[PDB]
């Protein structure tokens, strides 16, 4: 099914309200950009634009094994292009070139002359599409990336749909009809027209603002399959949520209301309700974010009660939120706010709260029990049950309650209330009145023949959140049977007292003379709101469990918190979704079933570990209490004073990161390379499986003492006679082994991925020292597949990557950057350590299963959707599945498996502006091993003076060291033991193999016994080949005799255009016989199976040939490097008209063609002038016409040396031929097939 689908891009002047650059007031006026498409080929006749279209994403639904073509027409002023996600293409629109400085390979991207189509021709196949067990239809997206500032001012995102067919058989007629949800961000400050500022940044959804956005529909209870996609490329965020229904998949019930600032989710919604649905934002100012929408109605189509009645009450309870005082200790500037001043009120705050109370005495305030306040009541009920809750408000100000998740509520007695209110939203509650709510659970509480053991739901009030959060109204809901008593679940309730009414009474209750605050200062409003964790801090919350009980762990949270929170319990690894992980972030409205086992106690000081909290002196201590030879591992730390650069960025930056070492003394670091590029400016890469401890004797040399934290310290109750804490703070020159035993339960099922990845950090200074650079990852596997001592496994290649923010203020080294011998300098962005598109080293096998460990930590602005461009990665959930949805999350780290069938350079995406503006591209390269060819020196393409060395002597040249050359001078003699010869490759191509031979002088068979290859890229960053494992230093064995030729391959290839070889071990004399063997990343210089003489002779055609009675000199007979009588090719006569046609059956770009002479009769032949043609239909003739005379190259030095007509520039069209003009004695040409089958 060929899809003729076209696209266009234009700019409009519209405000999306109907039906010199200064703000104007009501609805203002601006210019907004939108895509417009013409289905027909008239470009002038367009179907009318509906008032509900706006910026709604143009979908492109596709089918497997079907070709799709997309075009675009330029109606703007600047060139743009389209960028794809997860689709294999051929770089025609990638938009990010590299260090070539060559002619127009793909330099048409930012070049769009008026018009042009520039079709892409995508291809979907079995690997490109879903499988049977995969979801019925997945989703993609597309966005331009060639233009940075224009896209940040346009934000014109598109959507894609790719999956199998199914519209041919009997399918439900609910698919397509063009429904999709997107989000956008508006700004035009740096537009082409462009215009102190007074211009804020706002967002728009589906291209409609202020009520002009329809789309909210209700219909029958049909399983509609609609996905929601969204992305953010700008700083700051906004609250967005949905009310209608939760996201339910298959037979596992998930009630997740996952509506995040950024979301790429493939799921469906269930449209059970008939009516209106609402999206709300947590912003007080209604002018900002006014996307309220009314209802548009259309039709999509045409377990027993038992007595569980309990009493629920409400009463106030005053609590001192800081029972412990630590004011005298003024060690870390903490006591600046502890001294009375403009805004010091105190700690006694009174407000009516909600919690259970068994009895109904109500004479005075009695003191309830410790650790059981501030929490809400537990509620247990059944389907269709009756239950009465007594509700009361101490203050005259009305509070109200409204259940969540419960839809079946009918008016009492009468269907319509005669009063002036016809809904349950505003029902007055007298301070002491009695009122109940009729609830009835739906029928999907118990599925067919599978009554669930237990499930997770929870409710609260959803009527007066602008005020409910000021009063702390939360109620737990336990809903299931025996398969509890201890109820001390941690909660986040931040006290918003500015909205609380009792503050206005506190004003005179606490301050007799408020003349010094004026009550109009915003700083008191900002300070008044204090952060609390379940109402108890300063060593006041505890918990304790043990083994062999029928009970599960439960943890809940309510509140969006305006940011992200990171809380967890070190030491105990909870099971979240059958995956074992330590550090889980806190996202609002989430609830799961979990159980944690009590295995090891241990007291270590720690906090809530948030970026901005834990500063108040909160510990939240758990205190669970009770009811073969190993591999030496070392971690070091050193500072490298290395500024990143001066051109395209004295100031100097020293960074200290975790390393790996060999022994206690700082003599040998065991420096490695290739496969262990992971270090960079990151931590070390540790391979460990089981039973081997890490006796890391961490000790710094550096210049100042600091500390190291394993993040998995597993010790028994050591330090007896009192549980004193760990001092840590490793000073230089000390011995302290941090060593712990890996656990067997931290290894997944064999059918699952066998190796799991975690990380470690330093707990003392996350933002002072860890953000200075000391962050280190770790890796733990299971079983034993890394056999032998060093593990030549060649199954999976393993790297990892990390994101963070580096600032100069975080480092300690501000004032001494002078070597101690406007304000743009304040804004630095950390990308793996190095910037300016020059971080290579991610080399990987072309065709093999490869496992990756995504990792990312740090602040808020260091997590975002990142994936390798143009690939397909997925994770197996106990079955074969294929989904490419996995992004960066704090702490949540898992393993992914993928294999790229294609080759070439790719690019790391950047979906955040502040980092794409830094100039980040940590690209990677992949090779093909099949290449075997000398790459410039054995055949003498290189020039003379481009090779230089120390000293030169008459009648001695080392260049003669080419292959199969001997006789007199075949080396260069020098008394000094070692030597160095530098040859440049003129380009950074791939290097695979190295070969050598021995020479003969006098009566000796000279050679080189052993040597090592070393290389670099610019002569200032020297590094050698330290791959293949099997020992840190390996010695390369040389030849054993004069005629010894061998073949060897480097498993990690060498990436360099320069190379210097240092023969340390030499045979008597400084023998110099070097032969470089190489290739390019294309790998398109091999015969296409034509070596087989069994191939058909009718597959090769021509104009004419040697035709006579003895016509056996066929053109295909003249094959390169074949022994035989008269084995050459001669035309019918001495005419230039004869060509050498070949079987094409596809369009190809020429790379190189070789031609040889014939070895018969011993006569030299050579060719001076010739020509090369090109045709597509046998009519036209267009070639590489340059600078007057067509580019001509001269070859055929003798009758025997072959020459390859490597045609770098594109000689297009489906016909390449040659015509020999110059000739000696008689025409006799020998040829060979070259190239590949691709594109």
């Amino acid at each position: 099914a060929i899809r003729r689908y076209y696209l266009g891009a234009v700019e409009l002047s519209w405000d999306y309200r109907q039906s010199g650059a200064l703000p104007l007031g009501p609805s203002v006026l601006y210019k907004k950009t939108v895509f417009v498409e013409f289905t027909d080929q008239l470009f002038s006749v367009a179907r009318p634009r509906p008032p509900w279209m706006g910026l709604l994403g143009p979908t492109i639904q596709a089918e497997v094994y079907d070709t799709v073509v997309v075009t675009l027409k330029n109606m703007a002023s600047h060139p743009v292009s389209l960028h794809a996600v997860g689709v294999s293409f051929w770089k025609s629109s990638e938009g990010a070139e590299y260090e070539d400085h060559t002619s127009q390979r793909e330099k048409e991207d930012d070049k769009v002359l008026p018009g042009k189509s520039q079709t892409y021709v995508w291809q979907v196949l079995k690997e490109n599409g879903p499988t049977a067990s995969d979801p019925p239809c997945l989703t993609y997206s597309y966005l331009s990336h060639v233009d940075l500032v224009k896209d940040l001012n346009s934000g014109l995102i598109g959507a894609l749909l790719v999956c199998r067919e199914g519209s041919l058989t009997r399918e439900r007629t609910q698919n397509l009809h063009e429904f999709v949800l997107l989000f956008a961000v508006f700004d035009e400050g740096k537009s082409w027209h462009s215009a102190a500022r007074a211009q804020p940044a706002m967002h728009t959804v589906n291209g409609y603002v202020n009520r002009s956005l329809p789309g909210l529909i209700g219909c029958h209870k049909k399983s509609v399959y609609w996905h929601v996609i969204g992305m953010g490329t700008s700083p700051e965020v906004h609250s967005i949520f949905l009310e209608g229904h939760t996201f339910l998949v298959r037979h596992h019930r998930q009630a997740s209301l996952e509506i995040s600032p950024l979301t790429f989710l493939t799921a469906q919604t269930f449209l059970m309700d008939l009516g209106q649905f609402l999206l709300f934002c947590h912003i007080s100012s209604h002018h900002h974010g006014g996307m309220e929408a009314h209802v548009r109605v259309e039709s999509c189509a045409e377990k027993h009660p038992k007595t569980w009645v309990h009493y629920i009450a409400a009463e106030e309870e005053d609590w001192d939120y800081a029972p412990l005082v630590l004011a005298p200790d003024d060690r870390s500037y903490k006591s600046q706010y502890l001294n009375n001043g403009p805004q010091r009120i105190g700690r006694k705050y009174k407000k009516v709260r909600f919690m259970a109370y068994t009895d109904e005495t109500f004479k005075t305030r009695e003191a309830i029990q410790h650790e059981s306040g501030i929490l809400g009541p537990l509620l247990y009920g059944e389907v269709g049950d009756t239950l009465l809750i007594i509700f009361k408000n101490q203050a005259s100000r009305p509070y109200n309650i409204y259940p969540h998740g419960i839809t079946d509520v009918r008016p009492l007695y009468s269907r319509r209330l005669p009063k002036g209110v016809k809904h349950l939203k505003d029902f007055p509650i007298l301070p002491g009145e009695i009122f109940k709510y009729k609830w009835t659970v739906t029928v999907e509480d118990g599925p067919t023949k599978s009554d669930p053991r237990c499930l997770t739901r929870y409710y609260s009030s959803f009527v007066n959140m602008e005020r409910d959060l000021a009063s702390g109204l939360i109620g737990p809901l336990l809903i299931c049977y025996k398969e509890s008593d201890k109820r001390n679940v941690i909660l986040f309730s931040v006290f918003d007292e500015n909205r609380s009414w009792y503050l206005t009474e506190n004003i005179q209750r606490f301050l007799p003379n408020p003349a010094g605050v004026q009550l109009e200062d915003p700083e008191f409003q900002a300070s008044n709101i204090m952060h609390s964790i379940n109402g108890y801090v300063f060593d006041s919350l505890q918990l304790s469990v043990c083994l062999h009980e029928v009970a599960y762990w439960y943890i809940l949270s309510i509140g969006a918190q305006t940011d992200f929170l990171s809380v967890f319990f070190s030491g105990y690894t909870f099971k979240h979704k059958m995956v074992y992980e330590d550090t889980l972030t806190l996202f609002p409205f989430s609830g799961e079933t979990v159980f944690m086992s009590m295995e090891n106690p241990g007291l270590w000081i720690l906090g809530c570990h948030n970026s901005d909290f834990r500063n108040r002196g909160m510990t939240a201590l758990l205190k669970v209490s009770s009811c073969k030879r190993t591999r030496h591992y070392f971690i070091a730390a050193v500072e490298q004073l290395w500024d990143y650069g001066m051109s395209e960025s004295v100031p100097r930056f020293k960074k200290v990161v975790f390393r790996e070492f060999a022994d206690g003394s700082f003599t040998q670091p065991s420096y490695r390379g290739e496969l262990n590029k992971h270090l960079g400016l990151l931590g070390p890469y540790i391979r460990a499986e089981v039973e081997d401890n890490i006796m890391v004797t961490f000790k710094n040399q550096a210049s100042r003492p600091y500390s190291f934290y394993s993040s998995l310290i597993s010790y028994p109750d050591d330090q007896e006679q009192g549980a004193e804490p760990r001092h840590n703070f490793v000073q230089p020159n000390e011995t302290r082994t941090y060593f712990w035993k890996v656990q067997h339960h931290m290894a997944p099922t064999e059918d699952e991925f066998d190796c799991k990845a975690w990380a470690y950090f330093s707990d003392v200074d996350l933002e002072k020292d860890v953000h200075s650079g000391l962050i280190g990852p770790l890796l733990i596997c299971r079983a034993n597949t890394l056999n032998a001592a060093h593990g030549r496994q060649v199954t999976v290649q393993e790297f990892a990557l990390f994101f963070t923010i580096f600032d100069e203020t975080k480092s300690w080294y501000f004032t001494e950057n002078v070597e101690r011998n406007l304000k743009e300098n304040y804004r630095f962005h950390a990308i793996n350590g190095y910037v300016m598109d020059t971080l290579p080293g991610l080399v990987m096998a072309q065709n093999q299963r490869i496992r990756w460990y995504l990792l990312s930590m740090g602040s808020n602005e260091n997590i975002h959707s990142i994936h390798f461009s143009g690939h397909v990665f997925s994770v197996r959930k106990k079955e074969e599945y294929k989904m490419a949805v996995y992004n960066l999350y704090p702490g949540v780290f898992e393993t992914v498996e993928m294999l790229p069938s294609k080759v070439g350079i790719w690019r790391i995406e950047c979906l955040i502006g502040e980092h794409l503006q830094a100039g980040m591209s940590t690209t990677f390269l992949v090779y093909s091993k099949k290449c075997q060819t000398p790459l410039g020196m054995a055949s003498g393409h290189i020039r003379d003076f481009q090779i230089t060395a120390s000293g030169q002597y008459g009648q001695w040249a080392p260049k003669l060291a080419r292959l199969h050359y001997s006789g007199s001078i075949n080396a260069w003699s020098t008394k000094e033991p070692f030597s160095w010869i530098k040859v440049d490759l003129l380009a950074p191509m791939i290097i695979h193999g190295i070969k050598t031979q021995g020479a003969r002088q006098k009566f000796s068979s000279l050679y080189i016994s052993q040597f090592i290859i070393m290389y670099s890229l610019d002569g200032k960053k020297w590094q050698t080949y330290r791959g293949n494992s099997t020992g840190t230093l390996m010695v390369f064995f040389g030849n054993v005799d004069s005629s010894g030729i061998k073949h060897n391959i480097f498993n990690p290839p060498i990436i360099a255009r320069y190379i210097r070889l240092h023969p340390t071990h030499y045979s008597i004399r400084s023998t110099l016989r070097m032969e470089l063997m190489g290739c390019d990343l294309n790998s398109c210089s091999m015969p296409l199976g034509m070596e087989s003489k069994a191939i058909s002779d009718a597959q090769i055609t021509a104009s004419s040939y040697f035709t006579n009675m003895f016509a056996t000199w066929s053109p295909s007979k003249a094959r390169l490097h074949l022994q035989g009588r008269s084995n050459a090719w001669r035309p019918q006569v001495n005419n230039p008209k004869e060509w050498l046609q070949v079987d094409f059956q596809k369009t190809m770009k020429v790379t190189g063609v070789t031609t040889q002479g014939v070895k018969s009769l011993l006569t030299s032949m050579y060719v001076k002038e010739f020509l090369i043609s090109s045709s597509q239909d046998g009519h036209q003739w267009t070639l590489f016409f340059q600078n007057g005379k067509v580019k001509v190259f001269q070859g055929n030095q003798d009758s025997f040396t072959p020459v390859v007509n490597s045609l770098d520039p594109p000689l297009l069209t489906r016909y390449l031929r040659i015509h020999p003009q110059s000739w000696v004695h008689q025409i006799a040409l020998r040829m060979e097939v070259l190239g590949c089958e691709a594109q």
Partner: antibody
Amino acid sequence: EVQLVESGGGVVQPGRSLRLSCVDSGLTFSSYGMHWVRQAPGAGLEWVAVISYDGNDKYYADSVKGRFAISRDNAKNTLYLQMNSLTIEDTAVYYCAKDLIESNIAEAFWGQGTLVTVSS
Amino acid sequence: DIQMTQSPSSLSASVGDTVTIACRASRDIRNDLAWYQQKPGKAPKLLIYATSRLQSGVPSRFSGSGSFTDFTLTINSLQPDDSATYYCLQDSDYPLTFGGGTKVDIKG
């Protein structure tokens, strides 16, 4: 390096022939390790000229001495002197030597020999 | 086609002298020729390496030089040990002829 030791006899007597050989201790030789020479003060290297050159050939300008058949090959150097007719032509301070190739201690070790005369 | 002779065959002079011995070659050859010193009753042994680089440890009396066709052996210390037979020999395959032997005579 490798020491050279002789294994044979040098006393000549008309009526019978013996075999001459020189053997090393370690075969750090190549396929071109064959030459023969003796003493001739104020004269050539046999009496007016050298026995042989050309690496592995028994020939200088005339009188090809192919009769000097060589037994075994490669890492051993040996050739038989015809004591039946040369006689006085085979009397000198003999050396078993060969131009070494490593050249780190002494490029050319030499034999010792003894006083030899005709049997009267 | 190398045909070389050796001159002279005998000599005698006073003390504190410095002379040089040479051999006439035929055509272009290399600097690596042989020089064995044989006193009357000692095995001929080389003292200068390749005639181009003086071997380490060899006394300063012997100092060889020359290339192409000419070669010069300079003496720096005079002794009555002049009884020593030299031989100008080239290392090559093509037909070559070496020197005749310089055995000096003792005056009385």
